[PDB]
Each structure stands twice: as C-alpha cells, then as structure tokens.
C-alpha cells in the first residue's frame, strides 16, 4: 500500500474595492458665487459651495479562505 | 495498491467593485451663481452649489472560498 | 505501508481597499465667493467653501485563513 | 579652322517674396477696450488684443547655382 | 586650328525674402485697456496685449554655388 | 594648334533674408493698461504686455562654394 497525499494550492483570492486606479485630471468649476443679506443654517444642515469631495467608505471587502485537508487510514 | 491524491488548484477568485479605472477629465461647470435676500435651512437640509462629489460606498464585495480535501482508506 | 502527506500551499489571500493608486492632477475651482451681512450656523451644521477633501473610511477589508491538516492511522 | 565660343550672359534671376516696400502709417491709433468677467476656459487659448507684432519667417529664400564648362579637343 | 573659349558671365542670382524696406510710422500710438476679473483657464494660454515685437527667423537663405571647368586635349 | 580657355565670371549670387532696411519710427508711444484680478491658470502661460523685443534667429544663411579646374594633356 501507499497513499501519496500531495494537494497543491496556487489560488489567488482577492478584494479590490473602493476608489482604485482612477484619474481625476484638472477637476473643478470656473466661478461659484453665493450672495445674500443672511445665510442661516440651524439643524443638521450640510452645505457645499464650490468644494470638491472624494469620499470612500468600505465596510465590505473582506476575504475568507477555509481548507480541511483530512486523511484517515 | 496505491492512491495518488494530487488535486491542483489554480483558482482566481476576485471582487472588483466601487469606482475603478475611471477617467474624469476636466469636470465642472462654467459659472454657478445664487443670489437672494436670505438662505434659510432648518432641519436635515443638504445643499450643493457648484461643488463636485465623487462618492463610493462598498458594503459588498466580500469573498468566501471553502474546500474539504477529505481522503479515507 | 507508507503515507506521504505533503500538501503544498502557495496561495495569496489579499485585500486592497479604500483609495489606492488614484491620480489627482491639479484639482480645484477657479474662484469661489460667499458674501453676506451675517453667516449664522448653530446646530450640527457642516459647511465647505472652496475646500478639497480626500476622505477614506475602511472599517472592512479584513482577511481570514483557516487550514486543518489532520492525519490519522 | 577658327572657333570663337563667346556667349555673353547679362541675365538676372530674382525672387522677391513676403512683405516688401509697404508703408504702415499710424497703425493702431484708436481705442481698444476689453472688459471681461466671470469666464471659464477648459482648453488652449490664443489671444491678441491691440497687438502689432512684426513676425518674419523664411525657411526658404535659398539660391542654388550650378554651371559646368568643358572643352574637348580630339 | 585656333579655339577661343571666352564665355562671359556678368549675371546675378538674388533672393529678397522676408520683411524688406517697409516703413512703420507711429505703430501703436492709441489706447489699449484690458480689465479682467474672475477668470479660470485649465489649459495653455498665449496672450499678447499692446505688443509690437520684431521677431525674425531665417532657417533658409543659404547659397550653393558649384562650378566645374575642364579642358581635355587628345 | 592654339587654345585660349579664358572664361570670365563676374557674376554674383546673393541672399537677403529676414528683416532688412525697415524703418520703425516711434513704435509704442501709446497707452497700455492691464487691470487683472482673481484669475486662475492650471497650465503654461505665455504673456506679452506692451513688449517691443527685437529677436533674430539665423540657423541658415550659410554659403557653400565648390570649384573644380582640370587641364588634361595627352
């Protein structure tokens, strides 16, 4: 008798996520103007005037690998 | 008698998700103008004036791989 | 009898997430102007005027590997 | 025998090209106003306002002369 | 036998290429006003305001003269 | 036998290229105003305001003269 247990694993298991390899070339507007007597913001207001945001959230993107190389005679 | 147990794994398992390999070449408007007596924002208002957002959320994109290389005589 | 238990693992398990390998070439607007008699922000207000944000959250992206090389005569 | 090979060449070969012999008397002299506000340009701009440059370019205007004389006797 | 080989060349080969013999009398002399505010340019700008440069370029204008005289006797 | 090989060359090969013999009398002599505020440039700018530069470039204008005289007897 002989048993020759030689499994080979060469696997790649990968996550690529969020903002990857993008090109942002000269972003932005010409003129932005806001004119008022008053600007009045009073509960959970978000305001953006002529600003640029690059924003990435990755709560995902995880990897799992499980192997059970059992042998029994 | 012989058992020659030699499974070969070459697998690529991949996630590519979100914003990937994009080109954003000279984004933006010419002129944006807002004029008023008052701007008045008072509960959960979101305001965007001439701004650029690039925004990526990836709660997904996960990987699982499971293998059970069992042998029994 | 002989048992020749020689599994080979050359696997890569990997995460690439958030902001990776992006190019941001000369970002920003020309002119941004805000004019008022008063600016009045009073509860959980967020304000952005002509600013650039690169912002990344990665609470995800984790890796797990399990192997169980059990042998029994 | 007698031979008298006596050609006479008084010719002129001339090239006159470009801006020759012009009179430009009080060019400009008036009023140019450009008022310009709140403009955006995403690509190349070339602009001339009230300009009077004298730009001269001559990659050509070269001359070639080849002439060739031979006398053969017997 | 008498041979007189007496060609006469008094010719002229001339080139006059470019800006030659012009008169420019009071160029400019006027009034150029640019008022510029709140402008954005994302790519190359070339601008001339009230300019009068004299720019001269001559990659050409070369001369090539080739002569070849030969007398062969017997 | 008599041979008189007596060619006469008084010819001239001439090049006049570029800016020659021009009169520039009181160029400029006017008013140039640039008022300029709140401008943004993201790429190369070339600007000339009220300039009158004399720029001359001559990669050419070279002369080649080749002569060859030979007398062969018997």
Swiss-Prot record, chains D, E, F:
List of residues that carry Phosphoserine: 19, 47, 51
Ranges occupied by Tau/MAP repeats: 1-31, 32-63
Modification N6-acetyllysine occurs at: 6, 12, 16, 26, 38, 42, 64
Result for mutant: residue 32 to M: In FTD1; ultrastructural and biochemical characteristics indistinguishable from Alzheimer disease; accelerates aggregation of tau into filaments
Subcellular localization: Cytoplasm, Cytosol; Cell membrane; Cytoplasm, Cytoskeleton; Cell projection, Axon
Annotated glycosylation sites: 42, 48, 64
Linked pathology: In Alzheimer disease, the neuronal cytoskeleton in the brain is progressively disrupted and replaced by tangles of paired helical filaments (PHF) and straight filaments, mainly composed of hyperphosphorylated forms of TAU (PHF-TAU or AD P-TAU). O-GlcNAcylation is greatly reduced in Alzheimer disease brain cerebral cortex leading to an increase in TAU/MAPT phosphorylations. Frontotemporal dementia 1: A form of dementia characterized by pathologic finding of frontotemporal lobar degeneration, presenile dementia with behavioral changes, deterioration of cognitive capacities and loss of memory. In some cases, parkinsonian symptoms are prominent. Neuropathological changes include frontotemporal atrophy often associated with atrophy of the basal ganglia, substantia nigra, amygdala. In most cases, protein tau deposits are found in glial cells and/or neurons.
Subunit structure: Interacts with MARK1, MARK2, MARK3 and MARK4. Interacts with PSMC2 through SQSTM1. Interacts with SQSTM1 when polyubiquitinated. Interacts with FKBP4. Binds to CSNK1D. Interacts with SGK1. Interacts with PIN1. Interacts with LRRK2. Interacts with LRP1, leading to endocytosis; this interaction is reduced in the presence of LRPAP1/RAP.
Name of the protein in question: Microtubule-associated protein tau
Species of provenance: Homo sapiens
Part of the whole protein covered: 623 to 696 of 758
